[PDB]
């Protein structure tokens, strides 16, 4: 129903082996369109989705200027914190950042954000009212004092409210046949006889999107919530996803167990048993 | 070891964020190369071939679009030799500060902007922002003064710059900064014109 555009920056330092390794990726829902690597022989912005690749040079270049410029900053941001907390000169670190914007099916901003973490540990974050910060510790307070005096919220806000959205509209529009579509999972069940008189049946649901999906097992029509074994959703490696649930069962009585799939690509939830050859 | 070259920046020492500046290194000595080096947060050294022409051996170092890292203290040297580099004595120190990264401070003159000669005047910069130090510059004056801030005091953070017996008028501007990053300054305070009667 509603979509969002999320950016993920990672600034990793390496005291000896060189300089800060900066990486950034951008998604529109479960789809990734941009990638930028500070190490590439040619550090530049790159497309990862059709829609956003349709754009032209000025764009890709204006975007690259931002990435190049970002890193250049995180570089200092790292060297900064390393001091805030007064740490080793040769003691590696990381500064992650997440920011983006959530919208209604009509467009319009629901919630925007922007938050950093130091060494996988919540650092500072732009508050929901898009006008204040929440420093995790004394160190991050320094940041705030500075950022408050620099009006970062005033600006960051404007993007979240202003362009963060507009862009998402634009992306949503051009990639409507992808992002605003569905692509239901191609389902099926595999029969693997485990131990004398027992068999394992997996219900596969692959190549679907978004990754949000639900798989359930029912015996005679009763939820097996308790004995339904299922792996966390993984990427097919081509933009779509996978997942499967399984339950142990008494041979023969297989046909009593039915699988249940609920995805957005499915108008109606799917029910399916194993189909024993012939 | 040769004589130290001369180092100057155009338009000047304080570089506005984004904006660019040029530090030129020159001497009557025919140095084949000039090395510009800044120390501090992110030390670095820039190489450059000398330009011999117009009675001067120079080299103009372009300090890219100003920002955080670029600010600091620079010094250059020249060398007759190539590859190894037979560095000369260090040019005088040049503190390249980056400005305009924070709220403008307010600059005032107690007893007032206008005063009779001899009388004592003192400027003061206050701000709701929590700058730890303030800087006071007088139009075309080489060095800038710098006093520490006065903590949370009913709305602000001050710093008073005594100027003693007023003799010559002048336009002043303040800047605020933070301890950890001393080459990162705020926006200039509206210029204040001090007049002596």
């Amino acid at each position: 129903g509603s979509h969002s555009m999320r950016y993920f920056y990672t600034a990793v330092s390496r005291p000896g082996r060189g300089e800060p390794h900066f990486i950034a990726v951008g998604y529109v829902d479960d789809t990734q369109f941009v990638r930028f690597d500070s190490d590439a022989a040619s550090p530049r912005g790159e497309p990862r989705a059709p829609w956003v690749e349709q754009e032209g040079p000025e764009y890709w270049d204006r975007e690259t200027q931002k990435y190049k410029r970002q890193a250049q900053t995180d570089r200092v941001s790292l060297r900064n914190l390393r001091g805030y907390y007064n740490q080793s000169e040769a003691g590696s670190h990381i500064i992650q950042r997440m920011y983006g914007c959530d919208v209604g099916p009509d467009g319009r901003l629901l919630r925007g954000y922007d938050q950093y973490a130091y060494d996988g540990k919540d650092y500072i974050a732009l508050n929901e009212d898009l006008r204040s910060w929440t420093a995790a510790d004394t160190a991050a307070q320094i940041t705030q004092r500075k950022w408050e005096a620099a009006r970062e919220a005033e600006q960051l806000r404007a993007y979240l409210e202003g362009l963060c959205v507009e862009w998402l509209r634009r992306y949503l529009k051009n990639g409507k046949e992808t992002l605003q579509r569905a692509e239901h999972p191609k389902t099926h069940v595999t029969h693997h006889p485990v131990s004398d008189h027992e068999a394992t049946l997996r219900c596969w649901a692959l190549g679907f999107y978004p990754a949000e999906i639900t798989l359930t097992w029912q015996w005679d029509g009763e939820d097996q919530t308790q004995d339904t074994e299922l792996v966390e959703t993984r990427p097919a490696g081509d933009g779509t996803f996978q997942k499967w649930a399984a339950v142990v069962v008494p041979s023969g009585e297989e046909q009593r167990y039915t699988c249940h799939v609920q995805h957005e690509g499915l108008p109606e939830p799917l029910t399916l048993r194993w189909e024993p050859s012939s | 070891v040769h004589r130290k070259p001369s180092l100057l920046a155009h338009p000047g020492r304080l570089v506005k964020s984004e904006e660019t500046v040029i530090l030129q290194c020159w001497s009557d000595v025919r140095f084949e190369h000039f090395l510009l080096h800044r120390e501090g947060k992110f030390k670095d050294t820039l190489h450059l071939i000398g330009e011999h022409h117009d009675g001067v051996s120079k080299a103009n170092f372009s300090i890219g679009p100003m920002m955080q890292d670029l600010a600091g203290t620079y010094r250059c040297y020249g060398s007759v030799t190539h590859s190894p580099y037979q560095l000369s004595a260090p040019s005088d120190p040049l503190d390249i500060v980056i400005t305009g990264l924070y709220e403008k401070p307010s600059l005032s003159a107690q007893p007032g902007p206008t005063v009779l000669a001899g009388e004592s005047v003192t400027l003061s910069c206050s701000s709701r922002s929590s700058y730890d130090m303030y800087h006071l510059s007088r139009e075309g004056e080489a060095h800038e003064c710098r006093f520490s801030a006065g903590p949370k005091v009913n709305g602000t953070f001050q710093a008073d710059f005594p100027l003693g017996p007023a003799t010559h008028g002048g336009t002043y501007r303040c800047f605020g900064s933070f301890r950890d990053s001393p080459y990162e300054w705020s926006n200039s305070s509206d210029p204040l014109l001090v007049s002596v009667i």
Binding site: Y7, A24, G26, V34, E63, K66, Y67, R69, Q70, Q72, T73, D74, V76, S77, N80, L81, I95, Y99, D114, Y116, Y123, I124, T143, K146, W147, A150, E152, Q155, L156, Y159, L163, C164, E166, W167 | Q68, L101, S181
Partner: peptide
């Protein structure tokens, strides 16, 4: 569109 980088942390 990525946010415009501002000041250092």
């Amino acid at each position: 569109g990525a946010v415009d980088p501002l000041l250092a942390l």
